[PDB]
């Protein structure tokens, strides 16, 4: 109940501040502006590099999720198996990184 | 594609299918299915054509929906049974969900719409890999859960698959769509006998795999994708036309060829259970499969369509394609009837 | 010279010292003049509920000692 | 086909996670350990047909432990009858169900 | 068996490759001073 | 330094754990008596509520076996107040 | 009673970030041979108040946004995840004592990029969209390296509880067994909050240029609160103080001094180096930081096993 | 199905051990050392019978013997135990390492008096 | 069964009906698929944590990761479509009707 | 009305699904999915799954939906009756289930659903000095060797597949 | 070999340091004699209750009291 109260308090302070910032000088009287950036008429061209680093982040994030419970897992009784599996997980992460390195995957966003 | 990367991807496909086959946990079945889908996606994108991209997108969407329905069935069986052992399911709703999920995976009608689409947009080797190897794991999963399979649903899917496959193959000119509709009809045949005797399902699966492998190998060897190039094949090499005529004869269930072996055995397991209308109806419908096979044999080997002037140049070069296991698969698919009781090794 | 920046750092240090002191004093005030009990696992919560059920006040921080036995 | 590679080779890959009464970390028991244990020791080695027709009692007990249909049905009946008698005025809650019990410990 | 609906259907290409059916341009204004018109490729 | 302090921390942790396992039996007995008292009170209330409903047996188990089954939370706090239910079933999760 | 604790947590955050703007201007000015503001108040103590009242009465821009929901929602999420993220901090006792406070802070760190994404999308200028995409990519990459470094340090610690970090650092600091992780963590938190030399939107466009004076001020408050809290997190994680259960004010004063020094170090780094390029900071992460992070992760997995130094779970 | 057999309210009545958690944690080691036999008998009965209703009398013995522990604390070593459990009770995690001198004094008084 | 089981199953059902009726885009269908995966995650972990199945708590994380990996693959396919027709409309994926 | 908190949360959950099942736009669908993910994390938080709830916040919302919206920003260029229609329809059926199961306390569509709160089916015991779900996840390395192997191989193969198929050559 | 190692120490010190740290991490647990100490430290933690055994009549190795000389000892953990 304390966490929900704190979340609600932070949220209501945030929207009170946003409403004040967005509406307090609206009641002032001024003059309006016309409806009109280097690329206004040009369309946005696709770039493969940003999407590639996005998916690389997603895959490394998934392997981070797999690697995360190691502090809890270090208190086990099969210490040899736990050490082997942890080292194998980080080794496969490094292998994926090196294979992305070798095949020019990290190019122009290195 | 690098040869090493292609080899690793193919062993990943094989490992996924093996993982589905040998596991006793539902989560590992799901894991193997995702392994198979993820590793087979780039093989369809081998040429980087817009048609290949659209085919891969359709295949991805259908397989994703099937896998999600499979996970829903697994979770329902978990709730109502408290265990994960791959055996009979303990809820009719989970059994129905899993059955339609595996029907979507196998291309059964009325979930068949992707099979003539996708196979048209991918190369011949990838289409062969699809239509033969992708059908092993869902058939194993269907084999393990037959105590919980509803008879009405599976027989409805079987008769719909057979009828729709025949009526679809009646229309096409392209070879890959013809093989897709033939595949749909054959899986209708294989699922029609599953609840009575699954050994016949295994036998029909093996025979269908050998026949599809032989036909796709012949098409790759002759580099033919439409019916007119298959007609042109008579000038370049007549032995290839003789082989495709014999293989198409065997694919239609014409005795004494080996394609008469599965379906007849299927009838022998459905008149034992006093079901007479269904096998007669299925044979009457498979006559349409025999019809478009006969149309292909008319176009290819029984007549000689005209050829062009540049074909003379092709007379000066021997073929160099690695026709792997083509004579063995041609012999095994056509003269296997006198060894019919060998199916008892699959019992 | 360089020490004219020190009033701002002093104000920031006061503003950062305020929440910790406030939290410590609130925790001591609301829990009978002692530290707030940490219940990270179910056993500690069971102990806290046992003290609340044994105090007779429905307050876990009112600890009953050896005077409450025969 | 189900190629039993694990039993042929003697390896263990997923049998530890198949059932709920298996070996657990720190020997933590599930809420339906005994019911599933009894059902498993019934249905071992007699086949699926005899398993589904012979000890339906144990499977019904395990399913009742798992989902608790009849327990909350009985609770619904008790609470509905209590609310009806409260509305009719023939019943009142005792002091120990109102919050002045000064409980056990 | 062509019908009215499947009358416009064309045969697929022999190699199954379809026809494939740009450079970004920016205008940095004068907002010493300089106006630059740049043509990028990513 | 970290290995020395971690070994000392392990020793202190097993000291605390052995204190807990020394304290376990009294709490186990208290919990058994408390849940038996709660079940008895619920049984008496069910007896004085369901005297009118036909075909109802007071205390009918929903299980075919006579083995003791650990009481579900709704079986214990079914007829209690809302705040007791909230403290019993969400007190640990909602405690900061 | 608890709402008093919440208010005494959240109002000093706003006071601290306003006087952090003042301290930044003064310390930055004195490092380049001039003075900071000393005219508005006594030694410029009234400067943030004047700036706030000026910014809250300026005319709003009213841009031609494609969507107004994202335009409103981006400051909402930015301020909410700036202020919520302070609560599990053990100073020396947290507001909310949680079992997985580190995971909570990492989750809000991953969640904070939606303000950048929605601010970039809501603005009609596509150049602002490009800048927002680059900022999002930088933030998620350094999120990856933050997660791995935090995992290794907590594997030394043994649990996800943030208050246990005070107990595990009673003898010696964790900057002594983990100084490469400390350096890389500091640089990663520097690059997380778009701090120099890793800011890009100031150099050659911004994603939040289209916002009015008020919403820009709110984005500034969120960013500076993130900076202060990240320095406090580094202080708790690597430079823990001596804690006396009978005098918590000793720990409060000690870690306040340390976090003040770390924030001054942030401003000091801002006024020493030129700006990185975008591809140069991608090269710094993916080809320099990540292999060392994976190697040190393997080392810190294996080190307590071979030294009999496994920390307790509780 | 069957009717649940439940003991009456007179079978569940016993003199409680009305002390807090820190009082128990202060004297937990000596309680384990001295009151071992009824505790072990009760726990063996609980783990073998798998039924609280079959173990109730054994539980009563625990609620007797533990009480006979605390009275011996009250007769001879009341004040060092009071200081020790107060020092334990102050801290949030009830750590043993924060109360070493009071524990030493309480243990010395207990050893030389009991 | 419990009330939350009905609510989670209804969420899965409406996300399935959202997937099966494409409107204009493909990203929306991908989002519907991830909504289905999220509902599966929630249902599985509720069932697992209710019954105190200890080992099975390792399962839903895998149920995330694999399916999340699949999502990445789907995104790439969409990008390839966006590289051909310039938009992710589903009414451009009809080159295989003939 | 507090004791139905999880159930109340579940309503918002299915409500959030109608936020993106109608498919208004990828940005609004992503916003609805974000709200649904936060609500589901709260739901599993109320059942004791703290690590799994923070997995939902860390990996689903901050990891995957970020990439989904990031790719959304590269399509659906910025500038209906059907969206509002199916939203209203789904909301009406959802409140029909709510009203019926709050009225007669026992409904059925495919399975029989009970109208009581979620608090009834909880356990009365204590887990001791550990969290059972925490050690269940921690047993991924001690017990789940095969699962770790197949998951790591799957992620490596996925990296290879992703960077292979987007080359275009 | 020595020329190659000096070359990569000249061009890419980061990769050399990372590979050295990874190799040390992968070969050092097999050589340090303190891994068994970690194993029996993790074994000796009493997470559960040591439920007693019924005395059939012949169990000389099991103790009758916690303070009895029988059972496992923990002097090695006390000293180390």
Swiss-Prot record, chain B:
Stated name of the protein: NADH-ubiquinone oxidoreductase chain 2
Its placement in the membrane is given as:
Multi-pass membrane protein
What this protein is reported to do is described as:
Core subunit of the mitochondrial membrane respiratory chain NADH dehydrogenase (Complex I) which catalyzes electron transfer from NADH through the respiratory chain, using ubiquinone as an electron acceptor. Essential for the catalytic activity and assembly of complex I.
Q: Which family does it belong to?
A: Belongs to the complex I subunit 2 family.
- One GO cellular component term: mitochondrial inner membrane
The catalytic activity of this protein is classed by the Enzyme Commission as 7.1.1.2
Pfam families listed in its UniProt record:
NADH_dehy_S2_C, Proton_antipo_M
The UniProt keyword set, sorted, is: Electron transport, Membrane, Mitochondrion, Mitochondrion inner membrane, NAD, Respiratory chain, Translocase, Transmembrane, Transmembrane helix, Transport, Ubiquinone
Originating organism: Ovis aries
Disulphide-bonded residues = none
- Provide the assembly information: Core subunit of respiratory chain NADH dehydrogenase (Complex I) which is composed of 45 different subunits. Interacts with TMEM242.
Where does the protein principally reside?
mitochondrion
Quote the gene name from the UniProt entry: MT-ND2
Membrane spanning stretches:
3-23, 25-45, 67-87, 96-116, 122-142, 145-165, 178-198, 200-220, 237-257, 274-294, 325-345
Q: Where in the cell is it found?
A: Mitochondrion inner membrane
Organism ancestry: Eukaryota, Metazoa, Chordata, Craniata, Vertebrata
Gene Ontology BP, a term: mitochondrial respiratory chain complex I assembly
Catalytic activity of the protein: a ubiquinone + NADH + 5 H(+)(in) = a ubiquinol + NAD(+) + 4 H(+)(out)
* Gene Ontology MF annotations: NADH dehydrogenase (ubiquinone) activity
Answer whether the UniProt record assigns the keyword Mitochondrion to this protein: yes
From Swiss-Prot, chain G:
Keyword annotations for this protein, in alphabetical order, are:
Electron transport, Membrane, Mitochondrion, Mitochondrion inner membrane, NAD, Respiratory chain, Translocase, Transmembrane, Transmembrane helix, Transport, Ubiquinone
* Membrane topology according to the record: Multi-pass membrane protein
Q: Which GO terms describe its cellular component?
A: mitochondrial inner membrane; respiratory chain complex I
EC number, as in UniProt: 7.1.1.2
Disulfide pairs here are none
Any Pfam family the entry gives: NADHdh
This protein is called: NADH-ubiquinone oxidoreductase chain 1
The species is Ovis aries
Swiss-Prot record, chain I:
Which parts pass through the membrane?
1-21, 29-49, 61-81
Q: Which UniProt keywords apply?
A: Electron transport, Membrane, Mitochondrion, Mitochondrion inner membrane, NAD, Respiratory chain, Translocase, Transmembrane, Transmembrane helix, Transport, Ubiquinone
Q: Where in the cell is it found?
A: Mitochondrion inner membrane
Q: Report the top EC class in one word.
A: translocase
Gene Ontology CC terms: mitochondrial inner membrane; respiratory chain complex I
Catalyzed chemical reaction(s): a ubiquinone + NADH + 5 H(+)(in) = a ubiquinol + NAD(+) + 4 H(+)(out)
Keyword Kinase attached: no
Pfam families to which the protein is assigned, alphabetical: Oxidored_q2
The GO annotation for biological process reads:
ATP synthesis coupled electron transport
* Annotated GO MF terms: NADH dehydrogenase (ubiquinone) activity
Which InterPro entries does this entry report, sorted A to Z? NADH_UbQ_OxRdtase_chain4L/K, NUOK/Mnh_C1-like
Main subcellular localisation: mitochondrion
Give the way it sits in the membrane: Multi-pass membrane protein
Keyword Disulfide bond carried by entry: no
Q: What is its EC number?
A: 7.1.1.2
Q: Could you say which protein family the record assigns here?
A: Belongs to the complex I subunit 4L family.
Q: What does this protein do?
A: Core subunit of the mitochondrial membrane respiratory chain NADH dehydrogenase (Complex I) which catalyzes electron transfer from NADH through the respiratory chain, using ubiquinone as an electron acceptor. Part of the enzyme membrane arm which is embedded in the lipid bilayer and involved in proton translocation.
Its subunit composition reads: Core subunit of respiratory chain NADH dehydrogenase (Complex I) which is composed of 45 different subunits.
Name of protein = NADH-ubiquinone oxidoreductase chain 4L
Native organism is Ovis aries (Sheep)
UniProtKB/Swiss-Prot annotation, chain J:
Report the transmembrane regions from the record: 1-21, 25-45, 47-67, 82-102, 143-163
Query: What is the reaction catalyzed?
Result: a ubiquinone + NADH + 5 H(+)(in) = a ubiquinol + NAD(+) + 4 H(+)(out)
The protein's topology relative to the membrane is: Multi-pass membrane protein
Which Gene Ontology BP terms does the record give? mitochondrial electron transport, NADH to ubiquinone; mitochondrial respiratory chain complex I assembly
Q: Which InterPro entries match?
A: ComplexI_Subunit6 (IPR050269), NADH_UbQ/plastoQ_OxRdtase_su6 (IPR001457), Nuo/plastoQ_OxRdtase_6_NuoJ (IPR042106)
Q: Which Gene3D superfamilies match?
A: NADH-ubiquinone/plastoquinone oxidoreductase chain 6, subunit NuoJ (1.20.120.1200)
- Predominant cellular place of this UniProt entry's protein: mitochondrion
Q: What is its EC number?
A: 7.1.1.2
Where does the record say this protein resides? Answer: Mitochondrion inner membrane
The record's Pfam families line, in alphabetical order, gives:
Oxidored_q3
| A GO CC term attached to the entry | respiratory chain complex I
Domain of life per record: Eukaryota
Keyword entries, A-Z: Electron transport, Membrane, Mitochondrion, Mitochondrion inner membrane, NAD, Respiratory chain, Translocase, Transmembrane, Transmembrane helix, Transport, Ubiquinone
- Could you tell me one molecular function GO term of this UniProt entry? NADH dehydrogenase (ubiquinone) activity
Q: What does this protein do?
A: Core subunit of the mitochondrial membrane respiratory chain NADH dehydrogenase (Complex I) which catalyzes electron transfer from NADH through the respiratory chain, using ubiquinone as an electron acceptor. Essential for the catalytic activity and assembly of complex I.
User: Which family does the record assign?
Assistant: Belongs to the complex I subunit 6 family.
What PANTHER family does the record tag this protein with?
A: NADH UBIQUINONE OXIDOREDUCTASE SUBUNIT ND6, NADH-UBIQUINONE OXIDOREDUCTASE CHAIN 6
Describe its assembly: Core subunit of respiratory chain NADH dehydrogenase (Complex I) which is composed of 45 different subunits.
Query: Which organism's genome codes for this protein?
Result: Ovis aries
């Amino acid at each position: 109940m304390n966490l929900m109260i704190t979340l609600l308090t932070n949220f209501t302070l945030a929207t009170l501040l946003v409403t004040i910032a967005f509406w307090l000088p609206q009641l002032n009287v001024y003059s309006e502006k016309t409806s009109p950036d280097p690329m206004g008429s040009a369309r946005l061209p696709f770039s493969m590099k940003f999407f590639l680093v996005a998916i690389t982040f997603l895959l490394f994030d998934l392997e981070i999720a797999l690697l995360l419970p190691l502090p809890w897992a270090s208190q086990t009784t099969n210490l040899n198996t736990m050490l082997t599996m942890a080292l194998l997980l980080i080794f496969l992460l490094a292998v994926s990184l090196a294979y992305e390195w070798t095949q020019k995957g990290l190019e122009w966003t290195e | 594609m690098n040869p090493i990367i292609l080899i690793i991807i193919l062993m990943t496909v094989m490992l996924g299918t093996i993982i589905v086959m040998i596991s006793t946990h539902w989560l590992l079945i799901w894991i193997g299915f995702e392994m198979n889908m993820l590793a087979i996606i780039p093989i369809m994108m081998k040429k980087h054509n817009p048609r290949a991209t659209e085919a891969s997108t359709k295949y991805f969407l259908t397989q994703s929906t099937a896998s999600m329905l499979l996970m829903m069935a697994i979770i329902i069986n978990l709730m109502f049974s408290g265990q994960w052992t791959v055996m009979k399911l303990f809820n009719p709703m989970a059994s129905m969900l899993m059955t339609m999920a595996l029907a979507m995976k196998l291309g059964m009608a009325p979930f068949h719409f992707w099979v003539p689409e996708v196979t048209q947009g991918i190369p011949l080797s990838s289409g062969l890999i699809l239509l033969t190897w992708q059908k092993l794991a869902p058939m194993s999963v269907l084999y393990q859960i037959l105590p919980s399979i509803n008879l009405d649903l599976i027989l409805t899917l079987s008769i719909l698959s057979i009828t729709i496959g025949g009526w679809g193959g009646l229309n096409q000119t392209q070879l890959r769509k013809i093989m897709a509709y033939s595949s749909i009809a054959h899986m209708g045949w294989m699922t029609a006998v599953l609840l009575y005797n699954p050994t016949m399902t295994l036998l029909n699966l093996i025979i269908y795999i050998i026949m599809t492998s032989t036909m796709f190998t012949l098409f790759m060897a002759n580099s033919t994708t439409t019916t007119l190039s298959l007609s042109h094949t008579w000038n370049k090499a007549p032995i290839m036309t003789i082989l495709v005529l014999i293989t198409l004869l065997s694919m239609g269930g014409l005795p004494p060829l080996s394609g008469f072996m599965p379906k007849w055995m299927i009838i022998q397991e459905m008149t034992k259970n006093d079901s007479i209308i269904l096998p007669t109806l299925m044979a009457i419908t498979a006559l349409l499969n025999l019809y478009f096979y006969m149309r292909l044999t008319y176009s290819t080997a029984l007549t000689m369509f005209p050829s062009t002037n540049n074909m003379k140049m092709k007379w000066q070069f021997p073929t160099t394609k690695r026709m792997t296991l083509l004579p063995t698969m041609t012999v095994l698919s056509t003269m296997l009837l006198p060894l019919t009781p060998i199916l008892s090794i699959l019992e | 010279m360089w020490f004219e920046v020190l009033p701002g750092i002093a104000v920031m240090g006061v503003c950062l010292f305020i929440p910790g002191m406030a939290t410590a004093r609130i925790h001591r005030f609301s829990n009978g003049g002692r530290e707030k009990r940490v219940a990270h696992y179910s056993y500690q919560w069971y102990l806290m509920e046992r003290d609340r059920r044994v105090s007779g006040v429905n307050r876990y921080y009112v600890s009953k000692g050896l005077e409450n036995i025969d | 086909p189900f190629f039993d590679v694990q039993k042929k080779l003697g390896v263990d890959l997923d049998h530890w996670m198949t059932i709920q009464s298996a070996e657990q970390p720190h020997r933590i028991p599930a809420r339906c350990h005994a019911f599933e244990k009894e059902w498993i020791e019934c249905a071992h080695g007699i086949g699926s047909i005899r398993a589904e027709k012979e000890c339906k009692i144990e499977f019904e007990d395990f399913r009742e432990c798992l989902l608790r249909q009849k327990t909350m049905k009985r609770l619904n009946a008790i609470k509905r009858q209590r609310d009806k008698l409260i509305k009719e005025g023939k019943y009142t809650p005792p002091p120990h169900h109102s919050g002045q019990e000064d409980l056990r410990p | 068996y062509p019908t009215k609906e499947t009358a416009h259907w064309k045969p697929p290409p022999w190699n199954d490759v379809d026809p494939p059916k740009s450079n970004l341009t920016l205008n940095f204004g004068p907002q010493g001073v300089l106006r630059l018109v740049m043509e990028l490729s990513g | 330094s970290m290995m020395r302090w971690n070994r000392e921390r392990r020793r202190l942790q097993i000291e605390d754990f052995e204190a807990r396992i020394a304290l376990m039996p009294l709490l186990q007995a208290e919990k058994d008596r408390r849940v038996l008292q709660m079940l008895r009170e619920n049984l008496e209330e069910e007896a004085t509520i369901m005297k009118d409903v036909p075909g109802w047996k007071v205390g009918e188990s929903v299980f075919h076996t006579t083995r003791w089954v650990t009481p579900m939370m709704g079986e214990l706090y079914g007829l209690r107040t809302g705040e007791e239910i909230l403290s019993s079933t969400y007190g640990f999760i909602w405690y900061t | 009673m608890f709402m008093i604790n919440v208010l005494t947590l959240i109002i000093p955050i706003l006071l601290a970030v306003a006087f952090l703007t003042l301290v930044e201007r003064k310390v930055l000015g004195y490092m380049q041979f001039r003075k900071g503001p000393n005219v508005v108040g006594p030694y410029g103590l009234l400067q943030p108040i004047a700036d706030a009242i000026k910014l809250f009465i300026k005319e709003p821009l009213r841009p031609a946004t494609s969507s107004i929901s994202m335009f409103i929602l981006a400051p909402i999420l930015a301020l909410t995840l700036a202020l919520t993220m302070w609560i599990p901090l053990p100073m020396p006792y947290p507001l909310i004592n949680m079992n997985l406070g580190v995971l909570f802070m990492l989750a809000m760190s991953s969640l904070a990029v939606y303000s950048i994404l929605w601010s970039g999308w809501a603005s009609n200028s596509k150049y602002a969209l490009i800048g927002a995409l680059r900022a999002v990519a930088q933030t998620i990459s350094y999120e990856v390296t933050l997660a791995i470094i935090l995992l290794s340090v907590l594997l030394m610690n043994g649990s996800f509880t943030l208050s246990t970090l005070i107990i595990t650092q009673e003898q010696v600091w964790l900057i002594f067994p983990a100084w490469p992780l400390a350096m890389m963590w500091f640089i990663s938190t520097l690059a997380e909050t778009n701090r120099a030399p890793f800011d890009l939107t100031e150099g050659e466009s911004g994603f939040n240029v289209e916002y009015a004076a008020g919403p820009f001020a709110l984005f500034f408050m969120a960013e500076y609160a993130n900076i202060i809290m990240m320095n406090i997190f580094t202080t708790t994680l690597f430079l823990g103080a001596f804690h006396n259960p009978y005098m918590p004010e000793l720990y409060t004063i000690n870690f306040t001094i340390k976090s003040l020094l770390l924030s001054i170090t942030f401003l000091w780094i801002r006024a020493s180096y030129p700006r990185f390029r975008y591809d140069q900071l991608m090269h710094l992460l993916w080809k320099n930081f990540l292999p060392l992070t994976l190697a040190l992760c393997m080392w810190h997995v294996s080190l307590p096993i071979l030294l009999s130094s496994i920390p307790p779970q509780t | 199905p069957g009717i649940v057999e439940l003991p009456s309210l007179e079978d569940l009545k016993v003199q409680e051990v009305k002390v807090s958690s820190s009082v128990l944690k202060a004297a937990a080691h000596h309680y384990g050392a001295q009151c071992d036999k009824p505790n072990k008998e009760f726990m063996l009965c609980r783990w073998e019978e798998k039924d609280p209703r079959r173990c109730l009398e054994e539980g009563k013995l625990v609620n007797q013997c533990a009480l006979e522990f605390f009275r011996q604390i009250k007769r001879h070593c009341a004040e060092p135990f009071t200081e020790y459990w107060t020092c334990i009770d102050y801290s949030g995690l009830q750590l043993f390492r924060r109360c070493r001198k009071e524990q030493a004094q309480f243990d010395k008084c207990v050893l030389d008096k009991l | 069964m419990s009330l939350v089981y009905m609510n989670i199953m209804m969420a899965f059902t409406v996300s399935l009906t959202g997937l099966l009726m494409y409107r204009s885009h493909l990203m929306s269908s991908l989002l519907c698929l991830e909504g289905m995966m999220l509902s599966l995650f929630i249902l599985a972990t509720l069932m697992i944590l209710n019954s105190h199945f200890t080992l099975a708590s390792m399962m839903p994380i895998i149920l995330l990761v694999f399916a999340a990996c699949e999502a990445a693959l789907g995104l790439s396919l969409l990008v390839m479509v966006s590289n051909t027709y310039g938009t992710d409309y589903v009414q451009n994926l009809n080159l295989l009707q003939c | 009305m507090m004791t139905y908190i999880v159930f109340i949360l579940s309503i918002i959950f299915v409500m959030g699904f109608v936020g993106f099942s109608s498919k208004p736009s990828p940005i609004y669908g992503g916003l609805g999915l974000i709200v649904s993910g936060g609500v589901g994390c709260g739901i599993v938080l109320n059942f004791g799954g703290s690590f799994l709830g923070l997995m939902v916040f860390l990996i689903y919302l901050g990891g995957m939906m970020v990439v989904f919206g990031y790719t959304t920003a590269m399509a659906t260029e910025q500038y209906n009756k059907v969206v509002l229609g199916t939203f209203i329809t789904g909301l009406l059926m959802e409140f029909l289930m709510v009203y019926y199961v709050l009225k007669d306390k026992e409904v059925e569509i495919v399975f029989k659903f009970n109208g009581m709160g979620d608090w009834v089916i909880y356990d009365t015991g204590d887990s001791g000095f550990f969290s059972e779900e925490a050690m269940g996840i921690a047993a991924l390395y001690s017990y789940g060797t095969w699962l770790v192997i197949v998951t790591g191989w799957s992620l490596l193969i996925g990296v290879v597949v992703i960077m292979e198929i987007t080359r275009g050559n | 070999v020595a020329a190659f190692l000096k070359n990569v120490w000249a061009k890419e010190p980061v990769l050399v340091a990372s590979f050295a740290i990874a190799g040390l991490a992968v070969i050092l647990p097999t050589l340090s004699p303190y891994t068994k100490y970690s194993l029996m430290i993790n074994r000796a933690t009493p997470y559960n209750y040591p439920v007693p055994l019924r005395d059939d009549g012949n169990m000389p190795d099991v103790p009758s009291h916690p303070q009895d000389p029988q059972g496992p000892s923990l002097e090695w953990l006390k000293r180390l």
